[PDB]
Design a protein around this nucleic acid. Sequence first.
RNA 1: CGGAACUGAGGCCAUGAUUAAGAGGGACGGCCGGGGGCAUUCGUAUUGCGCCGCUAGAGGUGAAAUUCUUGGACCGGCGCA
Length: 52
Amino acid sequence: SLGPQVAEGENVFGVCHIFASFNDTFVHVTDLSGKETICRVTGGMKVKADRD
RNA sequence: CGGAACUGAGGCCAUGAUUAAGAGGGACGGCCGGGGGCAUUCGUAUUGCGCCGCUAGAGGUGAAAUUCUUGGACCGGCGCA
């Protein structure tokens, strides 16, 4: 029961927190507070070499 | 009689001081300014430290490595110095 307030229109908010720069890129979904995290992901966990 | 030193009272002179620098000094009035010294309050950032959460990479390069990394890095969060 993940957000059991079932109305099929009650949208559930989060925040994303993109940290972009050179040599990296992060995507860090969290709740409204930034205290609880949901699947932080990067660019280095997908490609093979370090210059891409 | 001359010229010496000294002391007293008087009338006379149209009776005596050049102006005030587009030279300067000082005074006075209202302002002006990241001018100078002493004490005072504020700011985000950085670095470290503590506690919480999820997860394998993070840095840095033209490209790499030295280096940090499940004994929990980098990211996010609240505090403190």
